[PDB]
Amino acid sequence: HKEFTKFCYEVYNEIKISDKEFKEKRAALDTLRLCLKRISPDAELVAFGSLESGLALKNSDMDLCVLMDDTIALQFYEELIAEGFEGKFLQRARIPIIKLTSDGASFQCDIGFNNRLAIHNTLLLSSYTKLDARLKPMVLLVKHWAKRKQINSPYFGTLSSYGYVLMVLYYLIHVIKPPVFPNLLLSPLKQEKIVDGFDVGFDDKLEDIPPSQNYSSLGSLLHGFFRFYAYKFEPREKVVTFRRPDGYLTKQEKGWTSKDRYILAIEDPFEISHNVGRTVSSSGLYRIRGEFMAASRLLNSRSYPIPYDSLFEEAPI
Ligand SMILES: O=c1ccn([C@@H]2O[C@H](COP(=O)(O)OP(=O)(O)OP(=O)(O)O)[C@@H](O)[C@H]2O)c(=O)[nH]1
């Protein structure tokens, strides 16, 4: 897997966020943080998602959250419009969202209100990123593949990027032997921490966690990932889980047999009642499995040189 790993790192270095782009987004956060602090001094504007965990590709969108504990949401929107930012305010029932698009760098940022669970799972992925240097390039390459193969559209019957990140994590914890990572949620050193009615606790003392016993290359880890979800993983029977010591959970045990969509079952590490794969339709899953099989077929090809570039060739929309 020497040559494929060489290719993997070549692509990784092209698709990852630049330090310039990251500093630009951090500068943007500080400006937005000032507009909030001038309307509500007790409120805090926190970043979450790819950018915060360091699993972001270049030209990435921002995911921000305003921590409170009530008309502050509309007031903050009005302050941002006054400051010079362009965007819209949207509220469905009691959940407001600010969606910005201008100002002085290129903008495409989303602001949520009290998405505490999201900040916490972003902490979990941040910890794993700090545990092994192979996770960041592996996650970026999977996200680049899913985007290019048109299987990263939740509103079109396929899966979210967060979904793919959990698919990678589950493989690296509970499938690959030796494991790349331990399950931090099930550590004896883990302590319960209830946030919005869910346990967000895990072992965060990474300094005491022994190093990985898995010494495989990035190229090898990726080949295994594709091979696992293409031929071994059966979505009609099993649930992707972070709550079982062996990673073994049937849909029967979970009660996810018949949000009511359980075509592909990815149980969130903290919000265990929420199936991260609820967006995946039957036809969407058919396309996902097809692309996984295609990736596997390519990687074990006996025709040299292997056209590795085809792994990221854009599929018809
Ligand atoms: O089902 C979900 C989806 C997303 N989230 C929360 O929103 C964030 C992911 O939002 P995204 O689904 O957009 O994935 P991503 O940002 O990590 O990668 P890109 O957009 O760059 O393609 C994650 O960090 C997670 O915390 C959930 O909590 N549950």
UniProtKB/Swiss-Prot annotation:
Residues where UTP binds: 50, 118, 121-122, 143, 147, 161-162, 274
Catalytic reactions on record: RNA(n) + UTP = RNA(n)-3'-uridine ribonucleotide + diphosphate; RNA(n) + ATP = RNA(n)-3'-adenine ribonucleotide + diphosphate
Enzyme class of the recorded protein, top EC level: transferase
Residues annotated for ATP binding in this entry: 278
Variant or mutagenesis effect after changing residue 274 to A/N: Abolishes the UTP specificity and converts Cid1 from a TUTase into a poly(A) polymerase (PAP)
Effect noted on mutating residue 232 to A: Impairs binding to RNA. Also impairs binding to RNA
Residues binding Mg(2+): 61, 63
EC numbers: 2.7.7.19, 2.7.7.52
Any GO molecular function: UTP binding
UniProtKB keywords: ATP-binding, Cytoplasm, Magnesium, Manganese, Metal-binding, Nucleotide-binding, Nucleotidyltransferase, Transferase
Cofactor(s) the record lists: Mg(2+); Mn(2+)
Result of changing residue 268 to A: Leads to diminished TUTase activity
Effect of residue 110 to A: Abolishes catalytic activity
Keyword ATP-binding: yes
GO annotation, biological process: negative regulation of nuclear-transcribed mRNA poly(A) tail shortening; polyuridylation-dependent decapping of nuclear-transcribed mRNA; RNA 3'-end processing
Family: Belongs to the DNA polymerase type-B-like family.
Record-given protein name: Terminal uridylyltransferase cid1
Organism: Schizosaccharomyces pombe (strain 972 / ATCC 24843) (Fission yeast)
Residues of the full protein shown: 41 to 379 of 405
